């Protein structure tokens, strides 16, 4: 009966380590410490009352070393360099953090799932997981004070720092930068209304989430039927699905399970119409926030 | 839109550093290091040929302080004691752990809200938030090995640890014990067919979730109409809802929102007849894993 699927972040306890505070005048957030580099977002040069438009240029210009203040609550970290890379600042300190863990910097891909440690103040307060949605957004959950909180993957014992946090939108998601310095999709860390492109289910991940049902004795929506790639993802462009792009993950799950994608792919174009009052692991709708990989770990222990 | 509402565990590092392995014979999993005690599910003195009613007194008396191993990987503890509380072991071990959290033991009451710190061979590899069930199990994703993972609390900077696993049931969810040894509910650490009992939808939580659908604009099933706690307790016991118990949490909600408890109560009845066809934070269905705090926390920063 019960998936056995939860929403698993990493251990966050390589990350806590790297967190700390960064102050610039009247704005506070939170900084990202490796090495002898303090990344924040570069909004904290900006004073509260320009952060619709501001210029970022002038306002870098007309910052020094010293109008830079990082602490570390869970220390002070004396500023020595400073510069912008696109929307984030990379401070560079006195002090090496000593518990620098191996890492990477990576790019989300819509659909695919990061851990995200929230944090005020430099204190990390709480950790969770999201999906990065095809506009680019996070159904996350974030306050005042919580920018410059981190997003990561993890292979192995690295780390692959992926978000860094800027930014709430009109309808409550959530967005930020990669650690290139490029806000995720189209959007501008600036405190203006900007379009919002529509967001999409995850084609491949419903594809998941459907095998987990089947992993756990739940099929009724299987049927002979098949649907190619190829006609579903002309399908998908019309109904605000993702194109699906199969994976060694997914067919890992079709070997398991013996049921082909392309039978699943007909069984999402049949259920998008409607359930017809039965249930899915429990849902009535389509589930897009568990990926091909979350059900391989979690369900089978690959 | 979007609620803002994640399933949110606290930073894991604290207890991480308190995670080891134990061994003993054939069997082994995970214990918690605190001070000179690691505390472990009793279960790893059994022979995985005797897990199915298995004689633990007699176990215990034929184990001396060499049966078991203890390593920490994130050392070796030498083991100098042994002890039974109800289901799990506490040995003592020469070395107190130099990253002790300062933390208590407490058992949590249905439909409060924990983190689990999972953990295969001593190794934390995922965490996540829970609710206890009413009928005592957890909605969990525990695999084969993660028996000793632990769940924790937290006020401050302290960590009230209130679960270490043991077991999954037939329908998938999955249950352990409190510090004290006592296994939550009616259960018995026992590779055996058990009872269990229905679940139910915690009231309390519900409230708080439709609570979070007004301060997040969607309020369409808020009526004048008003149930009385009594009359709604009364009613909840007929229709597999826990009786409603306020809460200050909750009344803060109900002050914020100019909604009283009483009107979502009947919301909560007439709803549980059907949404027809509408939705609440896109659920067509009650919810019930995310609790007052939750609500108080992320969506207003209490
Ligand atoms: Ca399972
Ligand atoms: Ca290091
Ligand atoms: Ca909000
Ligand atoms: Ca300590």
Not at 172 to 177: A, I, K, M, Q, V
Not at 206 to 216: D, G, K, R
Not at 242 to 265: C, H, P, R, W, Y
Request: hydrophobic share 40%; glycine share 8%; charged share 10%.
């Amino acid at each position: 009966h019960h998936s056995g699927l939860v929403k698993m972040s990493h251990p966050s306890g390589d990350v806590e380590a790297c967190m700390v505070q960064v102050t610039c005048g009247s704005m506070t957030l939170n900084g990202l410490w490796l090495d002898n580099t303090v990344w924040c977002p570069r909004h904290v040069m900006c004073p509260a009352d320009q952060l619709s438009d501001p210029n970022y240029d002038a306002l870098l210009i007309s910052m020094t070393n010293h109008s830079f203040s990082v602490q570390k609550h869970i220390a002070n970290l004396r500023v020595v360099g400073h510069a912008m890379q696109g929307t984030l600042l990379k401070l560079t300190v006195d002090v090496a953090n000593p518990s620098t863990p191996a890492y990477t910097f990576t790019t989300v891909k819509p659909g695919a799932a990061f851990s995200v440690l929230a944090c005020y103040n430099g204190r990390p307060t709480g950790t969770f997981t999201v999906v990065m949605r095809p506009n680019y957004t996070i159904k996350g959950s974030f306050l005042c004070g919580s920018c410059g909180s981190v997003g990561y993957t993890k292979e192995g014992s690295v780390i692959n720092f992926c978000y860094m946090h800027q930014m709430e939108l009109a309808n409550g998601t959530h967005t930020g930068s990669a650690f290139d310095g490029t806000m995720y999709g189209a959007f501008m860390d600036k405190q203006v209304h900007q379009v919002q492109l529509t967001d999409k289910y995850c084609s491949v991940n419903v594809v998941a989430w459907l095998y987990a049902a089947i992993l756990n004795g739940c099929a009724w929506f299987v049927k002979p039927n098949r649907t190619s790639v190829v006609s579903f993802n002309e399908w998908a462009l019309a109904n605000q699905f993702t194109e699906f792009v199969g994976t060694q993950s997914v067919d890992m799950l079709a070997v398991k399970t013996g049921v082909a994608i392309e039978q699943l792919l007909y069984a999402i174009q049949q259920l998008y119409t409607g359930f017809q009052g039965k249930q899915i692991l429990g849902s009535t709708m389509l589930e897009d926030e568990f990926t091909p990989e979350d059900v391989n770990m979690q369900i089978m222990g690959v």
